[PDB]
Coordinates of C-alpha atoms and ligand atoms in Angstrom, one line a residue:
Chain A
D26 CA -0.2 0.5 0.1
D27 CA 3.5 1.7 0.2
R28 CA 4.3 0.4 -2.7
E29 CA 0.4 0.9 -4.8
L30 CA 1.4 4.9 -3.5
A31 CA 4.9 4.3 -4.9
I32 CA 3.8 2.7 -8.4
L33 CA 1.2 5.8 -8.6
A34 CA 3.0 8.6 -7.7
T35 CA 5.8 6.7 -10.0
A36 CA 3.2 6.7 -13.0
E37 CA 1.8 10.8 -12.5
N38 CA 5.6 11.5 -12.5
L39 CA 6.4 10.1 -15.6
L40 CA 2.8 11.1 -17.5
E41 CA 4.2 14.2 -16.5
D42 CA 7.5 13.5 -19.6
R43 CA 5.9 11.3 -21.6
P44 CA 2.2 9.4 -22.9
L45 CA 1.3 6.0 -21.9
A46 CA 2.1 4.4 -24.6
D47 CA 5.9 5.0 -24.2
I48 CA 5.4 4.2 -20.4
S49 CA 6.3 0.5 -20.1
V50 CA 5.4 -1.3 -16.6
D51 CA 9.7 -1.8 -15.9
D52 CA 9.6 2.2 -16.2
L53 CA 7.2 1.5 -13.4
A54 CA 8.5 -0.7 -11.6
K55 CA 12.0 0.3 -11.0
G56 CA 11.1 3.8 -10.5
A57 CA 9.0 2.9 -7.6
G58 CA 11.6 0.5 -6.6
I59 CA 9.8 -2.9 -7.2
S60 CA 10.3 -5.9 -9.3
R61 CA 8.0 -6.3 -12.6
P62 CA 6.6 -9.2 -10.7
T63 CA 6.0 -7.4 -7.5
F64 CA 4.5 -4.3 -9.9
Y65 CA 1.7 -7.3 -11.4
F66 CA 0.7 -8.3 -8.3
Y67 CA -1.0 -4.5 -7.5
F68 CA -1.7 -3.9 -10.7
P69 CA -3.3 -6.0 -13.9
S70 CA -1.5 -3.5 -16.3
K71 CA -0.5 0.0 -16.8
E72 CA -4.2 1.3 -18.5
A73 CA -5.0 -0.2 -14.6
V74 CA -2.3 1.9 -13.0
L75 CA -3.9 5.4 -15.2
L76 CA -7.5 4.4 -14.6
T77 CA -6.8 4.5 -10.8
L78 CA -4.9 7.5 -10.8
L79 CA -8.2 9.4 -13.2
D80 CA -10.6 7.6 -10.2
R81 CA -8.5 8.8 -7.7
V82 CA -8.6 12.5 -9.3
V83 CA -12.4 12.7 -10.3
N84 CA -13.2 11.3 -7.2
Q85 CA -11.4 14.1 -5.3
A86 CA -13.4 16.9 -7.7
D87 CA -16.6 14.6 -6.8
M88 CA -16.4 15.2 -3.2
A89 CA -14.8 18.6 -3.5
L90 CA -17.9 19.8 -5.1
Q91 CA -20.4 17.5 -2.6
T92 CA -18.5 19.5 0.4
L93 CA -19.3 22.8 -1.9
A94 CA -22.9 22.1 -2.4
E95 CA -23.6 21.4 1.5
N96 CA -21.5 24.9 2.9
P97 CA -22.9 27.2 -0.1
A98 CA -20.5 30.5 -0.3
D99 CA -22.2 33.5 0.8
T100 CA -21.8 36.1 -2.1
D101 CA -23.9 36.6 -5.3
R102 CA -24.7 34.3 -7.9
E103 CA -21.8 35.3 -10.4
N104 CA -19.4 34.3 -7.4
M105 CA -21.3 31.2 -6.6
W106 CA -21.0 29.6 -10.2
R107 CA -17.5 31.0 -9.9
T108 CA -16.5 29.0 -6.9
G109 CA -18.5 25.8 -8.2
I110 CA -16.7 26.0 -12.0
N111 CA -13.3 26.6 -9.5
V112 CA -13.3 23.0 -7.9
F113 CA -12.7 21.6 -11.7
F114 CA -10.3 23.8 -12.5
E115 CA -8.4 23.3 -9.6
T116 CA -8.7 19.5 -9.1
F117 CA -7.8 19.0 -13.2
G118 CA -5.5 21.6 -13.5
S119 CA -3.7 20.8 -9.9
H120 CA -3.1 17.4 -12.2
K121 CA -3.0 18.2 -15.2
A122 CA -1.1 15.1 -16.6
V123 CA -3.5 12.8 -15.5
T124 CA -6.1 14.7 -16.9
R125 CA -4.7 15.1 -20.2
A126 CA -3.8 11.3 -20.5
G127 CA -7.0 10.0 -19.0
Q128 CA -8.9 11.5 -21.3
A129 CA -7.0 10.1 -24.4
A130 CA -7.9 7.2 -22.5
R131 CA -11.3 7.5 -23.2
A132 CA -11.2 6.2 -26.6
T133 CA -9.2 3.1 -25.7
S134 CA -10.1 1.8 -22.6
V135 CA -14.0 1.4 -21.4
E136 CA -13.5 1.0 -18.0
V137 CA -11.7 4.7 -18.4
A138 CA -14.5 5.9 -21.0
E139 CA -18.0 4.2 -18.1
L140 CA -15.8 5.9 -15.1
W141 CA -16.2 9.5 -17.7
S142 CA -19.5 8.8 -18.7
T143 CA -21.3 8.1 -15.0
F144 CA -19.4 11.1 -13.3
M145 CA -20.1 13.4 -16.2
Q146 CA -23.6 12.1 -15.2
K147 CA -23.7 13.3 -11.8
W148 CA -22.3 16.5 -12.5
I149 CA -24.6 17.7 -14.8
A150 CA -27.5 15.8 -12.8
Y151 CA -26.8 18.5 -9.6
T152 CA -25.8 21.5 -12.6
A153 CA -29.6 21.2 -13.9
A154 CA -30.8 20.7 -9.7
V155 CA -29.4 23.9 -9.2
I156 CA -30.8 25.4 -12.1
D157 CA -34.5 24.3 -10.9
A158 CA -33.7 25.3 -7.8
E159 CA -32.6 28.9 -9.4
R160 CA -36.0 28.8 -11.9
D161 CA -37.9 27.5 -8.4
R162 CA -37.1 30.8 -6.7
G163 CA -37.7 33.3 -9.8
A164 CA -34.6 34.1 -10.1
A165 CA -33.4 32.4 -13.1
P166 CA -36.0 32.7 -16.3
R167 CA -37.7 29.0 -17.6
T168 CA -35.3 28.9 -21.3
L169 CA -34.1 25.4 -22.0
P170 CA -35.3 22.6 -20.2
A171 CA -32.5 22.4 -17.5
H172 CA -31.0 18.9 -18.0
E173 CA -30.6 19.6 -21.8
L174 CA -28.6 23.6 -20.7
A175 CA -26.3 21.9 -17.7
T176 CA -25.3 19.0 -19.9
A177 CA -24.4 21.4 -23.0
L178 CA -22.7 23.6 -20.0
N179 CA -20.4 20.7 -18.6
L180 CA -19.4 19.8 -22.2
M181 CA -17.8 23.2 -23.0
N182 CA -16.2 23.0 -19.5
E183 CA -15.3 19.4 -19.8
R184 CA -13.9 20.9 -23.9
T185 CA -12.3 24.9 -22.5
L186 CA -10.8 23.7 -19.5
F187 CA -9.2 20.6 -20.7
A188 CA -8.2 22.4 -24.1
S189 CA -6.4 25.5 -21.3
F190 CA -4.5 22.8 -19.5
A191 CA -2.8 20.8 -22.3
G192 CA -1.5 25.0 -23.7
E193 CA -4.2 23.3 -27.4
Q194 CA -3.8 25.6 -30.0
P195 CA -6.5 27.1 -30.1
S196 CA -7.7 27.1 -26.0
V197 CA -8.5 30.2 -23.6
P198 CA -4.9 31.0 -21.8
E199 CA -5.0 29.3 -18.4
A200 CA -5.4 32.2 -16.8
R201 CA -8.9 33.5 -18.6
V202 CA -10.4 30.7 -19.1
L203 CA -12.3 30.5 -15.0
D204 CA -13.9 34.1 -15.9
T205 CA -14.6 33.0 -19.1
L206 CA -16.5 30.3 -18.3
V207 CA -18.3 31.8 -15.4
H208 CA -19.5 34.0 -17.7
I209 CA -20.9 31.9 -20.2
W210 CA -22.5 30.1 -17.5
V211 CA -24.1 32.9 -15.7
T212 CA -25.3 34.8 -18.8
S213 CA -26.7 31.0 -20.5
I214 CA -29.1 30.8 -16.7
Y215 CA -29.8 33.9 -16.3
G216 CA -30.3 35.7 -19.4
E217 CA -33.3 35.4 -21.5
Chain B
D29 CA -9.3 9.3 -59.6
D30 CA -12.3 7.2 -60.2
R31 CA -10.2 4.4 -58.3
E32 CA -9.0 7.3 -55.6
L33 CA -13.4 7.8 -55.2
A34 CA -13.8 4.6 -54.4
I35 CA -10.6 3.9 -51.3
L36 CA -12.5 7.1 -49.9
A37 CA -16.5 6.3 -50.3
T38 CA -15.3 2.5 -49.4
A39 CA -13.1 3.8 -45.9
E40 CA -16.7 6.0 -45.1
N41 CA -18.6 3.3 -45.7
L42 CA -16.5 0.8 -43.6
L43 CA -16.2 3.1 -40.6
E44 CA -19.6 3.7 -40.2
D45 CA -19.3 -0.4 -38.8
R46 CA -15.8 -0.1 -37.2
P47 CA -13.1 2.2 -36.7
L48 CA -10.0 2.8 -38.6
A49 CA -7.7 -0.1 -36.3
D50 CA -10.3 -3.1 -37.8
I51 CA -9.8 -2.1 -40.8
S52 CA -6.9 -3.1 -43.4
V53 CA -5.7 -2.1 -46.1
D54 CA -6.9 -4.9 -48.3
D55 CA -10.3 -4.2 -46.4
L56 CA -9.8 -0.8 -48.4
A57 CA -8.0 -2.0 -51.8
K58 CA -10.7 -4.9 -51.9
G59 CA -14.1 -2.7 -51.5
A60 CA -12.8 0.1 -53.8
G61 CA -12.2 -3.3 -56.0
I62 CA -8.0 -2.7 -56.6
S63 CA -5.0 -4.9 -55.4
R64 CA -3.8 -3.9 -52.4
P65 CA -0.4 -2.3 -54.0
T66 CA -2.3 -0.3 -56.6
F67 CA -4.3 1.0 -53.4
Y68 CA -0.3 2.6 -52.1
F69 CA -0.3 4.3 -55.3
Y70 CA -3.2 6.7 -54.4
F71 CA -2.7 6.4 -50.6
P72 CA 0.5 5.9 -48.1
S73 CA -1.4 4.5 -45.8
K74 CA -5.3 4.0 -44.2
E75 CA -4.4 6.9 -42.0
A76 CA -4.2 9.3 -44.8
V77 CA -7.5 7.9 -46.4
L78 CA -8.8 9.4 -42.9
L79 CA -7.0 12.5 -43.2
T80 CA -8.4 12.9 -46.6
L81 CA -11.6 12.4 -45.7
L82 CA -11.7 14.8 -42.7
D83 CA -9.8 17.2 -44.9
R84 CA -12.4 17.1 -47.8
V85 CA -15.6 17.3 -44.9
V86 CA -13.8 20.3 -42.9
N87 CA -13.4 22.0 -46.2
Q88 CA -17.5 21.6 -47.2
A89 CA -18.3 23.3 -43.8
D90 CA -15.6 26.4 -44.9
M91 CA -16.8 27.0 -47.3
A92 CA -20.3 26.5 -46.5
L93 CA -19.2 29.0 -43.6
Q94 CA -17.3 31.7 -46.6
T95 CA -21.3 31.3 -48.1
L96 CA -23.0 32.3 -45.5
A97 CA -20.7 34.9 -44.7
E98 CA -21.2 36.8 -48.2
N99 CA -24.7 35.6 -48.3
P100 CA -26.2 37.0 -44.4
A101 CA -29.8 35.6 -43.3
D102 CA -32.4 38.2 -43.8
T103 CA -33.6 37.3 -40.2
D104 CA -33.3 38.2 -36.3
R105 CA -29.7 37.9 -34.8
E106 CA -31.4 34.9 -33.2
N107 CA -31.9 33.0 -35.9
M108 CA -28.6 34.3 -38.2
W109 CA -26.5 32.3 -35.2
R110 CA -29.0 29.7 -35.6
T111 CA -28.0 29.5 -39.7
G112 CA -24.2 29.7 -38.6
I113 CA -24.1 27.1 -36.1
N114 CA -26.1 24.6 -38.0
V115 CA -23.8 24.5 -41.2
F116 CA -21.1 22.5 -38.7
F117 CA -24.5 20.5 -37.3
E118 CA -25.8 19.7 -41.3
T119 CA -22.1 19.1 -42.5
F120 CA -20.7 16.8 -39.4
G121 CA -23.8 15.3 -39.0
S122 CA -23.8 14.5 -42.7
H123 CA -20.7 12.5 -41.9
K124 CA -20.8 10.8 -38.4
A125 CA -17.9 8.3 -39.2
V126 CA -15.8 10.6 -40.6
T127 CA -16.2 13.1 -37.7
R128 CA -16.0 10.1 -34.6
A129 CA -13.1 8.9 -36.7
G130 CA -11.3 11.6 -37.9
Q131 CA -11.6 13.1 -34.3
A132 CA -10.3 10.0 -32.4
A133 CA -7.2 10.1 -35.1
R134 CA -6.2 14.1 -33.5
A135 CA -4.9 11.6 -30.8
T136 CA -2.5 10.1 -33.0
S137 CA -1.8 12.2 -35.9
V138 CA -0.4 15.1 -36.3
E139 CA -1.1 16.0 -39.0
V140 CA -5.2 15.0 -38.7
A141 CA -4.1 18.0 -34.9
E142 CA -2.3 20.4 -37.4
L143 CA -6.2 20.5 -40.0
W144 CA -8.6 20.5 -37.2
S145 CA -6.3 23.3 -35.1
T146 CA -6.3 25.1 -38.7
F147 CA -9.5 25.3 -39.3
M148 CA -10.7 25.9 -35.4
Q149 CA -8.2 29.1 -35.3
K150 CA -10.0 30.1 -38.4
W151 CA -14.0 29.2 -37.7
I152 CA -13.3 31.2 -34.0
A153 CA -11.8 34.4 -35.7
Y154 CA -15.0 34.4 -38.1
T155 CA -16.6 33.9 -34.6
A156 CA -15.1 36.4 -33.0
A157 CA -14.2 39.4 -35.5
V158 CA -18.6 38.8 -35.9
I159 CA -18.5 39.7 -32.0
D160 CA -17.3 42.6 -32.1
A161 CA -18.7 43.6 -35.2
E162 CA -21.8 43.2 -33.0
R163 CA -20.5 45.0 -30.6
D164 CA -19.1 48.0 -33.4
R165 CA -23.2 48.5 -34.2
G166 CA -23.9 48.9 -30.5
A167 CA -26.0 45.5 -30.5
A168 CA -24.4 43.5 -27.9
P169 CA -22.2 44.8 -25.0
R170 CA -18.7 44.6 -24.5
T171 CA -18.2 42.0 -21.8
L172 CA -15.6 39.2 -22.2
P173 CA -12.7 40.0 -25.0
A174 CA -14.2 38.6 -27.9
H175 CA -11.4 36.1 -29.3
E176 CA -12.0 34.0 -25.7
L177 CA -15.6 34.3 -26.1
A178 CA -15.2 32.8 -29.5
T179 CA -12.6 29.9 -28.2
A180 CA -15.1 28.7 -25.7
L181 CA -18.3 28.8 -28.1
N182 CA -15.9 26.9 -30.5
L183 CA -15.0 24.5 -28.7
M184 CA -18.4 23.7 -26.5
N185 CA -19.9 23.1 -30.0
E186 CA -17.2 20.7 -30.8
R187 CA -17.7 18.8 -27.7
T188 CA -21.6 19.0 -27.9
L189 CA -22.0 18.2 -31.1
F190 CA -19.6 15.5 -31.4
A191 CA -21.3 13.7 -28.3
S192 CA -24.4 14.0 -29.7
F193 CA -23.5 12.5 -32.9
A194 CA -22.2 9.6 -31.4
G195 CA -25.1 9.2 -28.7
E196 CA -22.4 9.2 -26.0
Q197 CA -23.6 9.1 -22.6
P198 CA -23.8 12.2 -21.3
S199 CA -24.8 13.9 -24.6
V200 CA -27.9 16.4 -25.6
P201 CA -30.4 14.6 -27.9
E202 CA -29.9 15.6 -31.7
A203 CA -33.2 16.8 -32.2
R204 CA -32.1 19.1 -29.4
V205 CA -28.8 20.1 -29.7
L206 CA -28.9 22.6 -32.6
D207 CA -31.8 25.2 -29.7
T208 CA -29.3 24.4 -26.9
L209 CA -26.4 25.8 -28.8
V210 CA -27.8 28.7 -29.9
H211 CA -29.5 29.6 -26.7
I212 CA -26.1 29.5 -24.6
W213 CA -24.2 31.7 -27.8
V214 CA -26.7 34.7 -27.9
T215 CA -27.5 34.6 -24.5
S216 CA -23.8 35.1 -23.7
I217 CA -23.2 37.1 -26.7
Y218 CA -25.7 39.4 -26.2
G219 CA -26.2 39.2 -22.5
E220 CA -24.9 41.7 -20.1
Ligands
2H2_313 O1 -17.5 22.1 -14.8 C1 -18.4 22.0 -14.6 N1 -18.2 20.2 -14.6 C2 -17.4 20.2 -16.0 C3 -16.2 19.3 -15.4 C4 -15.6 18.6 -15.9 F1 -14.5 19.9 -16.6 F2 -14.0 18.5 -15.6 F3 -15.5 17.6 -16.9 C5 -18.7 21.8 -13.4 C6 -20.1 21.2 -12.8 C7 -21.5 21.6 -12.0 C8 -20.9 22.4 -11.6 C9 -22.3 23.3 -10.3 C10 -22.4 24.3 -9.9 C11 -23.2 23.9 -9.0 N2 -22.9 24.3 -7.4 S1 -22.5 26.2 -6.5 O2 -21.7 26.7 -7.4 O3 -22.0 25.6 -5.4 C12 -24.5 26.8 -6.3 C13 -23.6 28.3 -8.1 C14 -25.2 28.5 -7.6 C15 -26.3 28.6 -6.8 C16 -26.0 27.7 -5.9 C17 -24.8 26.8 -5.8 C18 -19.6 24.2 -12.0 C19 -19.1 23.0 -13.0
2H2_314 O1 -19.9 26.0 -34.3 C1 -19.2 26.6 -34.4 N1 -17.7 25.9 -34.8 C2 -17.2 25.0 -34.1 C3 -17.2 23.6 -35.1 C4 -16.7 22.1 -35.0 F1 -18.2 22.1 -34.1 F2 -17.6 21.8 -35.7 F3 -16.0 22.2 -34.2 C5 -19.4 27.8 -34.9 C6 -18.0 29.1 -35.8 C7 -18.7 30.0 -36.2 C8 -19.8 30.3 -36.5 C9 -20.7 31.3 -36.8 C10 -21.4 32.2 -37.2 C11 -21.7 33.4 -37.7 N2 -22.0 34.4 -39.0 S1 -23.5 34.2 -38.6 O2 -24.5 33.0 -38.2 O3 -23.8 34.1 -40.4 C12 -23.7 35.4 -38.4 C13 -25.0 35.5 -37.1 C14 -25.1 37.0 -37.0 C15 -24.5 38.2 -37.2 C16 -24.1 37.8 -38.5 C17 -23.8 36.7 -39.0 C18 -21.0 29.5 -36.0 C19 -20.9 27.9 -35.0

């Protein structure tokens, strides 16, 4: 479990410099101070290591969001949405290599794809429930179906956060991405 | 060139049923009514076939958008933005397998990635120029930097159009995706 954490730290450190395809099991064993068969005792494959790393990062974001949901900020609605979006900006932005590699793995691994899909459904359902609350309270007008609006806003964040972290061309500079998303969320949720 | 079109039609037809990884050069040659070495005369690889198919689809969208830019619809601004977004909805939605496969290839092929990147820069620059025109005319307020807003809106369309076409979970139903995007564009461009 000390050895399990070493393998995970090693893989995260190596993913900073090259993609999964260019990391071997022997690379992971060696960085973690173990042999190849001992590695295989903890994980069936390098792909299982990535899946665990992504799982931990996705769970970290999810728990931070649950914490925030229970403990709303005392501020205006634009700043509340910013604090929510910020959960993902900071959590995934603190783990850029796992983010990029976990995202590429969605194409090749059904476990990575299903993990992503489960959490995006949860985050979208929570986004729609808050939009519905805002509407029920008369702060937001009833425009699009809340679930469809929430779906597009979450997919926008996914693609736009992750492009910014990878410094893709094109992308929103990382120091501008938070304000850019919060503007689009607030205008599309509250705007007639 | 008759044989080149056959290879392209064959690959598009086969991509409807399986990914590129599961299509062989011999599969492409056989569907197009040629041998393997004759195939290799027209394309250096199955990846070069995908790149050409994506190139044709991206150019088709780009030209349709240029046509629209010169020949604006005579209608209210919400419907004008809808006609623009619709270029991509119809062009890429008419070529779903190429869209999905071209998008997966971005991870593995620098030519596919560079092609995508060039056109997204062009479409974003045109989006920002129209937003700037709307602002200059006093129809839209000066909120976010236009280029940053345009970048996020284009990345939203990319991810949300393509998720809907692939029937990803989660996604906006394809029959609702156009209205959903147009709402977010109009509110975020015109909303204070
Ligand atoms: O970015 C998101 N989803 C995509 C995640 C990604 F990027 F990692 F893919 C995201 C998902 C959900 C939220 C949210 C929220 C709402 N909670 S809230 O901000 O605390 C809030 C706002 C307004 C009133 C009450 C509470 C914000 C952002
Ligand atoms: O969807 C887009 N880009 C992403 C493409 C994708 F999805 F394939 F990745 C997209 C890019 C640009 C536009 C546009 C536009 C503006 N032209 S316009 O709609 O004709 C117009 C509107 C308002 C006033 C004047 C003209 C619309 C959509």
